[PDB]
Amino acid sequence: RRRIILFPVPFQGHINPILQLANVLYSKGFSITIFHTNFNKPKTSNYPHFTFRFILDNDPQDERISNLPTHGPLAGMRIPIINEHGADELRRELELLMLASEEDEEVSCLITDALWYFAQSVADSLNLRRLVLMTSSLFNFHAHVSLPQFDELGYLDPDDKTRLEEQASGFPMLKVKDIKSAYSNWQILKEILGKMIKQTKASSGVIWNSFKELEESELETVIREIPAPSFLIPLPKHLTASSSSLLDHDRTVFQWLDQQPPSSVLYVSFGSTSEVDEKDFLEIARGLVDSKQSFLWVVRPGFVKGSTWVEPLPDGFLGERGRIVKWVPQQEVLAHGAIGAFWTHSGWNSTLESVCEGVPMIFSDFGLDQPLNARYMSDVLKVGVYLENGWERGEIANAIRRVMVDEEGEYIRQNARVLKQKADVSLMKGGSSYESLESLVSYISSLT
């Protein structure tokens, strides 16, 4: 028997894809140990077939992580901190487990989130192969490697050059605006994405949460930039991420979806970390009302400054066609026949989820990879509408109706359907994903 150790980034968009991959790999006969912080831990009772081991986080706490907030923006600081100071403890924990390794057993490899760029030399120091799971898109990575051309061109200059600002030089699939919002945090991202790229290239293999027919324009870049083998597996086509939810599913929403006609409900979720002016919040609700479409709206507490929740909503916007909830099994909702469209913040999991369920999109974004994802889906795949100019009453309602009801948007509806079908075909025998997965399984067994 061969064991695989997976090490996720403790946030919802990173734990979902890696526990999905963990399950896929277990279905291939590997045994699974998940290294994880106590912080943001999943429900281990949802994984009786996995062994969990909690690290880096343990209660005699480091000065650098002991007082970090558990939600909002600042919680993400754990990622730079653990990267810069967790090598010693990761090495001990890995080495302890290999030492207790049973007779019949051998650790095939370590698989980490690509942001755990410190794990590469730790693994090397043990003569242990490390593979990388990318949780953002091939296209996004293509932009990271092209940063130096963006910087020297002045695109990553937040204050001024403000100038050309439609269509990027040498990267025509982007506009200048996309680049500016994605890398507006240049100070921190510049350093981190360097190390992430550098250590992903130096790894033993990269697993991408994607599929060849989703991002075919991007395959050449990955082959040329990454010497190790790459494997494209659309994790949502294998199973949803409900078992790794960090929140309680609202569960009442399916009885409500069962009361709606087919393709007639807008699903709306702006991301677990994002934030809006209280004003802009009221503008969003304005567009929904003005769309005349039924909607299911996930709103995370804190989405509105300064309220706990949407207190600033004039009570009774919802009425008949609208509902607001705090958390759902998102992909299961996207699979329900009532859903006709997904207004998303363009998180990569949400985008891939919607693509794998056949649901066309309305895109907003809040930087990082999000504007890139919206640009790509809306302009290249053409499976949604990108509200790329903020939050205006009518533009919002036009996009929703165009996707959901307008004749003019049939091609968007149809494109989503065709792309889902292509995702399904790629899992079958002789499909891109099927072979990517067959190769990954073969490859890992040869490491052992």
Ligand SMILES: C=C1C[C@@]23CC[C@H]4[C@@](C)(CCC[C@@]4(C)C(=O)O)[C@@H]2CC[C@]1(O[C@H]1O[C@@H](CO)[C@H](O)[C@@H](O)[C@@H]1O)C3
């Ligand atoms: C790659 C990233 C490095 C970091 C580090 C923190 C950093 C910053 C968030 C950029 C803004 C300044 C701060 C200091 C901040 O947290 O406010 C960057 C960029 C995003 C990081 O990634 C995760 O952040 C999680 C929530 O904080 C998201 O839930 C997850 O899905 C992200 O991948 C988090």
Ligand SMILES: O=c1ccn([C@@H]2O[C@H](COP(=O)(O)OP(=O)(O)O)[C@@H](O)[C@H]2O)c(=O)[nH]1
């Ligand atoms: O009500 C919700 C909202 C989101 N999610 C899940 O949370 C993840 C969010 O990841 P994404 O990359 O799309 O956005 P992020 O919040 O990390 O920026 C996705 O897997 C969603 O299916 C969910 O299960 N229920």
